Structure formats: structure tokens, C-alpha cells
Amino acid sequence: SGTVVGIDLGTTYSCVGVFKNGRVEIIANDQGNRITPSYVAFTPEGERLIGDAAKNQLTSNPENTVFDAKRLIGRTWNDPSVQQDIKFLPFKVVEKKTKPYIQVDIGGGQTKTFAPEEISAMVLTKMKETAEAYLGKKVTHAVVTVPAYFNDAQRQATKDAGTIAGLNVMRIINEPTAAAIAYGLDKREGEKNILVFDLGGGAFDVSLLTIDNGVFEVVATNGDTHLGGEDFDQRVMEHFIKLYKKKTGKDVRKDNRAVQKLRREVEKAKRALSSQHQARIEIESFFEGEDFSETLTRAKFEELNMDLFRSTMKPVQKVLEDSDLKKSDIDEIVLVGGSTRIPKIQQLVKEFFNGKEPSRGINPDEAVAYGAAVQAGVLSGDQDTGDLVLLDVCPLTLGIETVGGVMTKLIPRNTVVPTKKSQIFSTASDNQPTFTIKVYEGERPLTKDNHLLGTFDLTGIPPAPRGVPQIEVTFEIDVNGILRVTAEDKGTGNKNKITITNDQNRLTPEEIERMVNDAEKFA
Amino acid sequence: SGTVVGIDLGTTYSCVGVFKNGRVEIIANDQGNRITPSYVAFTPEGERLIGDAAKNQLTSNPENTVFDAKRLIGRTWNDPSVQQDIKFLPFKVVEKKTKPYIQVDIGGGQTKTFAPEEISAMVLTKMKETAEAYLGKKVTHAVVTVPAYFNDAQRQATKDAGTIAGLNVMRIINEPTAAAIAYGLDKREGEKNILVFDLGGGAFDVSLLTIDNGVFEVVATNGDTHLGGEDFDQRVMEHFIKLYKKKTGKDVRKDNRAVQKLRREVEKAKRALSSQHQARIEIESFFEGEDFSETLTRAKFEELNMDLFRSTMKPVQKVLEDSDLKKSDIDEIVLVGGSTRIPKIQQLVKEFFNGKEPSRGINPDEAVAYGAAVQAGVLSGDQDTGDLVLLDVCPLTLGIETVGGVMTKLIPRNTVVPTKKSQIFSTASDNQPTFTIKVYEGERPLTKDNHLLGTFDLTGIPPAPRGVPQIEVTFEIDVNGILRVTAEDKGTGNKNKITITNDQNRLTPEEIERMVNDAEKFA
């Protein structure tokens, strides 16, 4: 159905891929970013920001900047998860008819309430537009991913977000399953145990998947719903805000612009520290007159976060326990999320699994969208036409008995019918005057083990040395599937035949499959 | 449950049948009679008589001969029916704890009180013993019939009579319904109106039954609780007692033996007059020295009874009115009771219904027991074992799309699963390099109208003329109901497959029944 895209609708970031011309392409947005913040903002002037522009003004507009809608989507107001989450979300969440709604000022002082799926719809519209800019065609169809623990209400609300965004959501698939598909682990023969370690922007999900003869099962899930890359950013932000106040006496926290510039540089520093052992954070015109200039070492980054990093191992032990599996039972480790680039995190996981290397080759921020895009590729095949022709074929070899009780085939099994096949036969003895033609069905080399369909004689064979007379035996299957066997002395025109009908003495479909087992033993 | 008998527990006569070896047998008692008087008597010597022996000494022992217990059974003392009936019953009926009891001398001068159901128990014991003598086995189970107008108390008291007699009364069924069942009217398709005209020994019951798609309803009942064959006997008895006194001056009424012999001959005369137009009543040693010898014509029999005969039509008009039916609305007329053999009665009924013939073939005295015996036959099936095996079958045809958007089946609907089915397919075009296998579910001939389960390709088909390559497509449903579809080029071993799971995109039981409606349109 049309161009089908794969979308990772993430808690903090979303990512869109397309299977095009034999490859998955992860599509950069209009800012050149291959991931887009799951953020929506309303400015005082009534401007609607989605993605990077929404996230890069959160500090100055805390009330009318919406994020983490995925924490609320498909949930009731009195869900204890919702009651926890609203405590630290800076925008207003209210109950309407037992459901949570996000209340914002959309411009001037005009209050609106949005369903979580309406905020997610705006994020999915941005992902759709990103894909449309790249493809230069309208995108109408999508595969959208969700956490394995999402219930039916959460899956349907996610579908509804896509519908509102103008997408036919053909399938909702589990995030860890999408990541496994991205690495082609669905093409494994046998049973494989897959550990998906997904340390994202805002949440940590560990999933134990089994793949067994083409069937994926989510056996166990654990993690921490409030541990992610942004928490490591927060630890570094805290450090540098303290440090700046010590060194200048200036309190950065109440200045939205200063904070936003520091967050920005802190994120780039974190990425650099995945490639090298120190990063310079430099901000010209940082606070009042003065610049910012500090170095962050990897050691300091690790020290500020080591308790958070170490805590990621406990959920892994819990899914192994819940799955009743040993570390040695894990066939594949799949790393998902930006945070799995952190060398300390890679070390902790590898050490936990006694040196086992994880899967490599796909950007961990992009693996879920990649898998969704692969699955989208398969579903666009729904529009193709079946270019197969059914053949009518004879189900079992047909032949006659030759000297020694030998099955001599005239019509091989899987011959297209209707058909006519002939072979030349002769006498076994000098001046032999008669032939007995015994018609057999079956795959076995000796007719004692095949099914006798009928017999007839050819009499009055003129005298000749053995092997000299030429008798043509013809098997024909007509358009009605009736078998006629003719024997003709080519020297005289002397001829006899039998008509064999599917009336009496026909094998059962059971008996046929036992006989078909002995097909392809001899040519 | 064991040998189950059917018993008509009649006001004046009872009848027992058994369904044995494909036929109802109505069982003769030890006197050779297929009906037994509902009579119990206690002689001065303490002998207990039941049936024919009780009835054939009523004249000499009026106080300790009990009959018509069915008029009292399940009723309270102050029921106006009971207060009417005790006026002309010759045995003593008394109140104990608000219920009627029959008080008799059981021998010597020893007074006993019997519940009506205890008298009926003694009659049911005689019917049980009649059936046991015939079957040469103990009879433990029965179907017993009651008037349609019997209330719950009357039905339970009848059940209690059977329990006391050593019978498990499996079902109480209505007399007119039993008669309808005897004539197989329960096997009628559509709605039928049945008029049951039951002119018994002591009571006249008219019932309008509907049979509609296997359900019997008693719509309306009427009749005369005190009009029966014995009243026609009484009219003839009166005539001949007057006639004898005129001709001899002897008053027969006070001589029990003379009266009993006349009753006897009067009953046989009545039966004869249903077959011929005169009957001779001859009694040697009738009264004192002298014999009796008189002829009764049918004309005289009819004349003595014509007012009683004519009165049977009024209840018939009343049930038609109460049922809001026309004479032409009656589909079946069922005659029940000995008295319906009387030609005048048959004439009156046929004339009332403008020449419509009643049901024929069952003795009207035996039709109710016959119906009970049929119903008993069905209930003995309660002891049989279910010799059916549940099949696991595939609910909808499974197949692939062939050229033209054609549904080509691999697994027909109602195929037993697990299963594996194969067909051979080929190319539509010379040197075609690829197949697209589209897996469909449904009964419609074109796949646009069926449910798409999934697609996959088979690539790298070697060059050959169209129709030459042989690609085997296999559908297998495993023990878990998982569908796997394989396509294999038999020339190369090149193979691909899809696993289809009941996770996503599965039809609803609603959608399945709409599709099942189109099953069996094409083979």
C-alpha cells in the first residue's frame, strides 16, 4: 500500500526510515537530524513548534512545551503511573471523563486541552513530513513501534495518533522486536535467545525475546521507566551549574538561555566522550558579559553517573531470572539507544556476559526505526500481483511391469496433464506370441511394491528373435484425468488398450502421501 | 435407564407399553387384557384385588371397592371437585390434615385410610408386574401420562404413586401429547393444529395442541369430567333392568351377581355394535332359575345415548373458540378412548369437521400408553455412550493468488489439522525470474474478496519457457495451529518461506461467519 515508512515514536526522540531500492534509509529532518525530539510547543504569539525548535526553547516556556506524551498515551487518569508522572511534568495535566489531557495556552491566553495521542499525532505529522520531503511523494502508510509492555489501549491510542497524522498504521510492532529485525535475527534457524538492552533518552527497557522457527516471543521485560541519557546529561548540568556559581557567584538556573546553551554543549560533550577522553565546553556570551570554558573528562563523566550506569545491570539479572536463563543461554545481545554508545555502558554489558560481543553495524538511536522500515518494506508487497500458474500434474509415476517384476515408467510423477507418453518394448523370448501389459502407479522400483491399476494382453505377435519386434506402449491422460493405455505392434498395426477410471480401486490421499515419501529415490 | 415403560394411568382403565426392538408393544395382563381396570378391592377375608378381579366384584362389595382415585389425586379436601365427587363415590372419603383419604375395611373389621396416590400406586404396581411378566426383567423406570389440566400437586402426587410402586417416573407427560406422539405428529415440519378428542371410560377431554418446529403447546382444553363410555353402559343397563322387570316382575338392581353379569354382557354388546347393527345378550342362570335373552340394535343403543353423544360437540366448539381457530385450521384429528370406536361418535366428529378423516392405525384405548412408550424409548437412550470424535479442522480455505487475481486453494476449509498440502506452480512468462506468493484466507474465487495473511518472493528462477519450471508451494499447519508456507524451485532447491501467526491481522469470529456463508459455492 503506497510508500510505507517505519517510525520509532520514542519517549524523547522519534526516527523515520524507509526501505527503498533494496536498502533502509533513515531520513534526516529539515534541520539535518536523523532523530527528532518528541516535543511540541506553543509560543505566546500562537506559533506551533514541533521537534528541534520545540525542545530548543523549553527553558523559557516550561508551561506550554509538551514532551513525554508517551508516558500518558492510552492510560486512565487514576493509573498510578500517571499520578507519579504529573508530579514532575512542568505542563498542566488534567482529568476529562477519567482520561489525562494536556492543558496549554496555544497563544494570547487561549487555553486548549490535548489528548496525549493528539500531541503524538503532531510528532508523527513531523516524521511523515520528514519522509515526504525525502521521497517527494505523499506518505500514507506506516509501521509504528511501541514498548513490548504496552497494553491494547496504549497500542490503539498510538494507532489513533497515526490516524490523526494522516497515516494508515498497518501494524504496531514491539520496539525490541523491531531492533532484532533490524539485525536480521528473524532469519536465524533454530531457537535463539535475544537480550535487547535499550537505554534511551528517558527510559531503560531490557527485553528477553525468543526467535523459534519464524515466531518471536517476548518472554520477559524489565528496566527503569525513568532512567535514560537525559539523567546523565542532568548529572553533568548539576556539576557545571555548581562549578560556575563557585567560580563566579552567578546562579545560572533561573536564566533559561544560559541553561539551554549549557544543555546543548553538555549533550555534544557526552557524545565526544564516547569517542575521546576529554571534551571542551565553550559558550561565548554565556551569562551577562562572560563566556563559559570548562573541560569534562570521561573519568569525571563516569564518576558523576557511575551509580546510574551500575543500576542498569539489575534489570538484566531480573529478566534472565524471570526467563529462567543462564548468561551462556543468551545467543545475541542487541544494544538500542544513544546511551549504549557510552564506553562504560558497553564495558558493564560485555563484562556482565563474560566478554560476549553485542550486535554491531546499526546506529543504536536508529535500530528500532530501521526494523520498522524493514517490516514496512515487507507490507508494501501487499499491493503486488501473484504471477504463479497452477499446474495440473499426475500425482504418482505411472508405468508397466517389464521382465523381473520391474516398474518401467511411462508418465513420471509431476508430469503436466493432459499428456501422451510412449516407449518401445519388445519380446523377452524368440517368437514370443503374446504380451501381458500390467499398468502400475507408484514410485517403487519393483511393481510388487506399487499399485496395480489393470492388465490387458496384446496377442498375435509374429515370430521374430527376442528383442526384434517393436511394440509401442502409450499412456494418455485426457482433459478429464482418464488414463488410457495402448499397446501396438508397429510391424502389423495389431493394437489393444485399457481405459482406467477413478471409480474403483483408487488410492486414498493417505496412501498417496506414503507412496510420495519414496519419490526421488531413483530417477 | 434400564427397561423404561410407558403407562397410561387412566381414570377407569390403565395401559402399559414398551418400545422393544424397533416397535411399541402394548402388554396384555395375566387375564390377557391390554387394558386393566384402575380398581382396587379388599374382600371381607382380607384379600387385595387389583384390576379385573377388583372390578368384577364391585356390586357385592360397594364400600371396600376403590376406583376413580384419579379424581382425588393431588387435591385438597375442600376442592369443590372433591366435594362434588364424594357425593356419588360409594366408598368413604374423609379429611386428614386438609387432604382426602379413602377409608376401607381391609379384612375382618380393620379400618385403613389410603391416600389417593397409594391406591394409584397399587394400580401402577399391577401395570409394572404386567410389563415384568412380558419382559422377564425388573421394570424400574417409567413415563406416566396425566391430563393436560393437571396442576403441579396432581403431577407430583402421580409421581409419588409411581415411586411407591417401585418406579422411577422419569417424566410426566400430557395425555393428548402422548396420543399425538403415538401418531408421529411431533415429526411434522411447520406449524400444525391438532384436535385431540378423548372420550374415555369416565371422562371426556378435548385438547387443542400446536406442534411448531419441535415444540408442543396445549393451547386450550375443554370436555366433561363426568361423561364417558360407562355412562353409555349405564343407559343400556337402565333400559334392560326396566325391560326385565316389565317381562318378569323381578327387580335385578339389589342382586349384585345379576347386575355384574348384565354390565359384563352390556359392555361386549356395546363393542359388537361398533362392528355390526345388532347384538344378542344371553345370560344362563341370570336371576333365580331363569335365563336372560334380549337383542340390542345399534339404533336402540344410539337412541338411548343420542343426547350424551350430541353433547360431545359443544366442548369441541369451545376449544376452537378459546384457540381462536376455524374448523379448516385443524390439520389433524386424533381419536382417543374406546368410545371413539362408536360409529355415531365417529360420524358426529367427521360431520363437525365437514368430512375430514381422523388419524387411524392405533387402538384408541392404547394410543396414550403407545405415545408414553415411544417417549420411554427415547429416554432409555440416556444410558448410551457418545461415540463421536471432535475433529480439529481449518475454519477457512487457505491458498495463494495465481494469475488474474485467482484464489488457488492449498488447504480446503474443514481439512483436518495438523496438515501439510502441496501443489506445483510455474511461470506465467518465458524466463520469468521471480514469484510473488500471496497467502489468502477465504472462500471467494478472486483474492480481492479474501483476507491477505502475508507475502514473500522466490527469486533466482532459472530461464525456461513459461509453464516449464516446477515450484512446489507447501502449506503446513503445525500442532500449535501456526501456518508456514514454503515455495521451492524443484529444479534448483532454491527455497523461501513465511511463518503466519494468530497475533496481528486475524479475522474476528463475526468476519469468519460472513466468509463461511460463501463456502460450498465453488469446489
Author numbering:
A (entry chain A), B (entry chain A): 27 to 549
From the reporting publication:
The activity of BiP in the ER is subject to post-translational regulatory mechanisms, one of which is the transient sequestration of substrate-free BiP into inactive oligomeric assemblies. These homomeric BiP complexes are based on typical substrate interactions between the SBD of one protomer and the interdomain linker of another protomer. As a consequence, all BiP molecules of an oligomer are in a post-hydrolysis, domain-undocked state typical of ADP-bound or apo Hsp70s. This suggests a physiological role of oligomerisation in buffering folding capacity by transient withdrawal of BiP from the pool of active chaperones during periods of declining unfolded protein load.
Like typical Hsp70s, BiP consists of an N-terminal nucleotide binding domain (NBD) and C-terminal substrate binding domain (SBD) connected by a hydrophobic linker peptide. ATP hydrolysis to ADP causes domain undocking and closure of the SBD, leading to tight substrate binding.
